[PDB]
Design a protein around this ligand. Structure first.
Ligand SMILES: *[C@@H]1O[C@H](CO)[C@@H](O[C@@H]2O[C@H](CO)[C@@H](O[C@H]3O[C@H](CO)[C@@H](O)[C@H](O)[C@@H]3O)[C@H](O)[C@H]2NC(C)=O)[C@H](O)[C@H]1NC(C)=O
Ligand SMILES: *[C@@H]1O[C@H](CO)[C@@H](O[C@@H]2O[C@H](CO)[C@@H](O[C@H]3O[C@H](CO)[C@@H](O)[C@H](O)[C@@H]3O)[C@H](O)[C@H]2NC(C)=O)[C@H](O)[C@H]1NC(C)=O
Ligand SMILES: *[C@@H]1O[C@H](CO)[C@@H](O[C@@H]2O[C@H](CO)[C@@H](O[C@H]3O[C@H](CO)[C@@H](O)[C@H](O)[C@@H]3O)[C@H](O)[C@H]2NC(C)=O)[C@H](O)[C@H]1NC(C)=O
Ligand SMILES: *[C@@H]1O[C@H](CO)[C@@H](O[C@@H]2O[C@H](CO)[C@@H](O)[C@H](O)[C@H]2NC(C)=O)[C@H](O)[C@H]1NC(C)=O
Ligand SMILES: *[C@@H]1O[C@H](CO)[C@@H](O[C@@H]2O[C@H](CO)[C@@H](O)[C@H](O)[C@H]2NC(C)=O)[C@H](O)[C@H]1NC(C)=O
Ligand SMILES: *[C@@H]1O[C@H](CO)[C@@H](O)[C@H](O)[C@H]1NC(C)=O
Ligand SMILES: *[C@@H]1O[C@H](CO)[C@@H](O)[C@H](O)[C@H]1NC(C)=O
Ligand SMILES: *[C@@H]1O[C@H](CO)[C@@H](O)[C@H](O)[C@H]1NC(C)=O
Ligand SMILES: *[C@@H]1O[C@H](CO)[C@@H](O)[C@H](O)[C@H]1NC(C)=O
Ligand SMILES: *[C@@H]1O[C@H](CO)[C@@H](O)[C@H](O)[C@H]1NC(C)=O
Lengths: 227, 96, 48, 145, 145, 49
């Protein structure tokens, strides 16, 4: 199938808004994406061929509960990101404006779904947690797999094992060639407010693996047959 | 002569108690007869050019004229898998 | 020397449930492949 | 626990269904073996996992003297526990139509299988017809008394 | 009887002394069991075929069918249909059978170009508008409109 | 001195108790009996050895 090769060279990105540069990523075969960021600063994604409304494109946006996915001729901004702030007229926290695109033209497919991949059960005192995703685009179908695991502070992407379960599937019926990710900047009105967002990207390849299912029927080990 | 013999039988017990693979000539017969049956049961998963290897899928999804050209591929390949196993076992049986 | 089957009775209670997930002999048996017992038992060979 | 034809979501087949010990992940509908055939399924009305096992079966061997010597025979159900031959009674349909052996009265468990129509005797003889696992069978007059 | 089964297994009217392996016994299915999900509404696909106007083939329209009873016969009795061409299934089996994801691709075609909807064809529709796989599972239905 | 005796139900290996598969298998004639005979020949020899 189509996997992240063992011991392969992943890019590690740091992004920061810095209060008072980020060029679009390629998307070839598929992407492993992972992050360990506290306070939900990383949300969602764009995937597409052109990202400027000349051809159709994919948008995924998470928030505090449920996700929206929409496939459209979006005119994206060179920096797409999400703002959530306290609106005094509502005495509560929400988005102001959809500053991810300048325009959404005639969209073809619209979708909404369950939240997925929360933080830990009741949270904890900075003992860490890794979230892992695989995004794959084959025969016009876009497949999403993911996991999360608690991790002790040796280092993120630790040695050990855990496989990604399938979580979402959708026939977007479009070419994908590039992609981006949505940050949630806090923007506290008294204006702006800085925060960092660390994330890992590793493209997959057409590959043969040998998978060790334990008696519980979970993939507890694997061999990458071309390593 | 008795003490030499009694100690030489003592070394047989020690050798058989310590070493892993001295009976390899017998364990290899078990391992080859087990490997051959595991191989023969593996060839049930093979499609041989049919739409499925699972005979019940074909009979859940096709009717009694185009199902048959799937079933016949599986008959042809599985019958070849037995003819291979039985030839290998007739050859092994001559060595034993 | 550790055997993979010896051809003695499996009471079908042996075959269903958990054991088919962990012993290949069941997959073999459920596909019509049968190990037969030898005519002389291991006690009967030890006598000779 | 009974032999049935089944169909789960179009997956036709034949077997006995049983309470499984298997922890399917929520996205899984079918569980599968080394021969690439379905051995477990999640019932689509009540979400529980069922083991599928094929309905009981075995080889048969017929033990005979010469046809010129007698027409009576004994039958070995090879690899069968004799307590399962009370299930092999033709009360439901079976592949061998000749139910008469199932009358028993002289049923004997060998480790080769369930042997029917031959009486077991304690006094040993040379092996005439080999049943297996140290057992042999013969046609002769048994009148110790 | 089991002697007669050996005579046919050996193709001889006389069987000499021995033990003869004959036809394997099987317990047969006692009854037939069906388990589909207990969803009840008839599929909304009738609303696509009866639409005021279909999609243009350069922008062919794809609809999900989900969570419904696909009784195709009452749909085939709503309108005369000129074709039915099922590729991975026989039309007779469609009642006994369940589906994971069902997508209707819907558009309008000149009768000549319907020849190119078959798997692996080439021509302006298949080359640039609408390419189904050369191994797709499904059925193509068409009618003069 | 010997190896494991094996017997095979040719019919059940090839056809998983499908009757229409069994009716197609008869088109191939005696090959299943030849396999059964050959394996019976091997199996009877293990006791002889
Ligand atoms: C996360 O973001 C989601 C949108 O990206 C958001 O979904 C939106 O939720 C509101 C409130 O339920 C819906 O508003 C509509 O509600 C009814 C519909 O009949 C009307 O009275 C309203 O006037 C309005 O039309 C939006 O339609 C819905 N958007 C979508 C695309 O479904 C989630 O609610 C957000 N989650 C949280 C926790 O805030
Ligand atoms: C496959 O899943 C099984 C079910 O989750 C799991 O069995 C569970 O294993 C744990 C750890 O051994 C047991 O926890 C108990 O262990 C002993 C008592 O046996 C106590 O010292 C502990 O404090 C604790 O109570 C679970 O009881 C046990 N559950 C069951 C139903 O057996 C298997 O271990 C999993 N497989 C693998 C490879 O780990
Ligand atoms: C022929 O070969 C014999 C060995 O297979 C050898 O026997 C061995 O002789 C030595 C003494 O020469 C013995 O050694 C022990 O002797 C006493 C205790 O009895 C102690 O003082 C020593 O420390 C030592 O323990 C061996 O035990 C003995 N081995 C056996 C099996 O009896 C013969 O001596 C050889 N004969 C000739 C003519 O060469
Ligand atoms: C979405 O974008 C534009 C504007 O709605 C659409 O372009 C028009 O399409 C109609 C129908 O073919 C033509 O009559 C107009 O002349 C087009 N306008 C221009 C400026 O070219 C486009 O077709 C829409 N696409 C979809 C899929 O709805
Ligand atoms: C044949 O199968 C039966 C079960 O159907 C076996 O009977 C069990 O034997 C064990 C050991 O003696 C007992 O603990 C159980 O209580 C018995 N169960 C029943 C329902 O009687 C029998 O032992 C098997 N015989 C052989 C030769 O394997
Ligand atoms: C990963 O690849 C880059 C070049 O694209 C290289 O600079 C870097 O050192 C590589 N790291 C490893 C561990 O191979
Ligand atoms: C069958 O449908 C009814 C009505 O929707 C539902 O209450 C019931 O739970 C379903 N049956 C099962 C076994 O779930
Ligand atoms: C059958 O047995 C009789 C004696 O009972 C003997 O005369 C005859 O030759 C035998 N025939 C065969 C074919 O074995
Ligand atoms: C064999 O002998 C024992 C007594 O030693 C007896 O209990 C048993 O009933 C005998 N076997 C048969 C088949 O009668
Ligand atoms: C098609 O749908 C309309 C409602 O939009 C309905 O009146 C009409 O009867 C339907 N066609 C047929 C042939 O029933």
């Amino acid at each position: 199938d189509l996997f992240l090769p063992f011991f392969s060279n992943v890019t590690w990105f740091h992004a920061i808004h810095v209060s008072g540069d980020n060029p679009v990523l390629p998307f070839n075969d598929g992407v492993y994406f992972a992050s360990t960021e506290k306070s939900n600063i990383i949300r969602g994604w764009i995937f597409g061929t052109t990202l400027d409304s000349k051809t159709q494109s994919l948008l995924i946006v998470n928030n505090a509960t449920n996700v929206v996915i929409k496939v459209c001729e979006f005119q994206f901004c060179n920096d797409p990101f999400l703002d959530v702030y306290y609106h005094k007229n509502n005495k509560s926290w929400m988005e102001s404006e959809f500053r991810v695109y300048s325009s959404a033209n005639n969209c073809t497919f619209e979708y909404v779904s369950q939240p997925f991949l929360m933080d830990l059960e009741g949270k904890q005192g900075n003992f860490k947690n890794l979230r892992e995703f695989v995004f794959k685009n084959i025969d016009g179908y876009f497949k999403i797999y993911s996991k999360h695991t608690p991790i002790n502070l040796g280092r993120d992407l630790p040695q050990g094992f855990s496989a990604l379960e399938p979580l979402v599937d959708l026939p977007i019926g479009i070419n994908i060639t590039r992609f981006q990710t949505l940050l949630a900047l806090h923007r506290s009105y008294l204006g702006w407010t800085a925060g960092a967002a660390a994330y890992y990207v590793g493209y997959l390849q057409p590959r043969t693996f040998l998978l060790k299912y334990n008696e519980n029927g979970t993939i507890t080990d694997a061999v990458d047959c071309a390593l | 002569i008795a003490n030499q013999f009694n100690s030489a039988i003592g070394k047989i017990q020690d050798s058989l108690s310590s070493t892993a693979s001295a009976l390899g000539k017998l364990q290899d017969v078990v391992n080859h007869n087990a490997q051959a049956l595991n191989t023969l049961v593996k060839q049930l998963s093979s499609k041989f050019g049919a739409i499925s290897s699972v005979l019940n899928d074909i009979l859940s999804r096709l009717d009694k004229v185009e199902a048959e050209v799937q079933i016949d591929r599986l008959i042809t390949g599985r019958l070849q898998s037995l003819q291979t196993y039985v030839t290998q076992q007739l050859i092994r049986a001559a060595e034993i | 020397v550790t055997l993979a089957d010896a051809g003695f009775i499996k009471q079908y209670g042996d075959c269903l449930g958990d054991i088919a997930a962990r012993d290949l002999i069941c997959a073999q048996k459920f596909n019509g492949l049968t190990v037969l017992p030898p005519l002389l038992t291991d006690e009967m060979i030890a006598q000779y | 626990n009974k032999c049935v034809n089944f169909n789960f979501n179009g997956l036709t087949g034949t077997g006995v269904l049983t309470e499984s010990n298997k922890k399917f992940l929520p996205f899984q509908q079918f569980g599968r073996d080394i021969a690439d055939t379905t051995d477990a399924v999640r019932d689509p009305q009540t979400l529980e996992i069922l083991d599928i096992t094929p309905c009981s079966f075995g080889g048969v061997s017929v033990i005979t003297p010469g046809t010129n010597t007698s027409n009576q025979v004994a039958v070995l159900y090879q690899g069968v526990n004799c307590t399962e031959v009370p299930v092999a009674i033709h009360a439901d349909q079976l592949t061998p139509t000749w139910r008469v052996y199932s009358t028993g009265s002289n049923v004997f468990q060998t480790r080769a299988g369930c042997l029917i129509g031959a009486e077991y005797v304690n006094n040993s003889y040379e092996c005439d017809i080999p049943i297996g696992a140290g057992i042999c069978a013969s046609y002769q007059t048994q009148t110790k008394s | 009887d089991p002697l007669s089964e050996t005579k046919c297994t050996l193709k001889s009217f006389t069987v000499e002394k021995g033990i003869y392996q004959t036809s394997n016994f099987r317990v047969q299915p006692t009854e037939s069991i069906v388990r589909f999900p207990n969803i009840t509404n008839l599929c909304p696909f009738d609303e696509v075929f009866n639409a005021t106007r279909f999609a243009s083939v350069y922008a062919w329209n794809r609809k999900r069918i989900s969570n419904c009873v696909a009784d195709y016969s009452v749909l085939y009795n709503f309108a005369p249909f000129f074709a039915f061409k099922c590729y991975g299934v026989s039309p007779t089996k469609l009642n006994d059978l369940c589906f994971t994801n069902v997508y209707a691709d819907s558009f309008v075609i000149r009768g000549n170009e319907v020849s190119q909807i078959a798997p692996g064809q080439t021509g302006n529709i298949a080359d640039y508008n609408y390419k189904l796989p050369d191994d797709f599972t499904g059925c193509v239905i068409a009618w003069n409109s | 001195v010997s190896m494991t005796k094996t017997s095979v139900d040719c019919t059940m290996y090839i056809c998983g108790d499908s009757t229409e598969c069994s009716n197609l298998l008869l088109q191939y004639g005696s090959f299943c009996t030849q396999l059964k005979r050959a394996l019976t020949g091997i199996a009877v020899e293990q006791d002889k050895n």
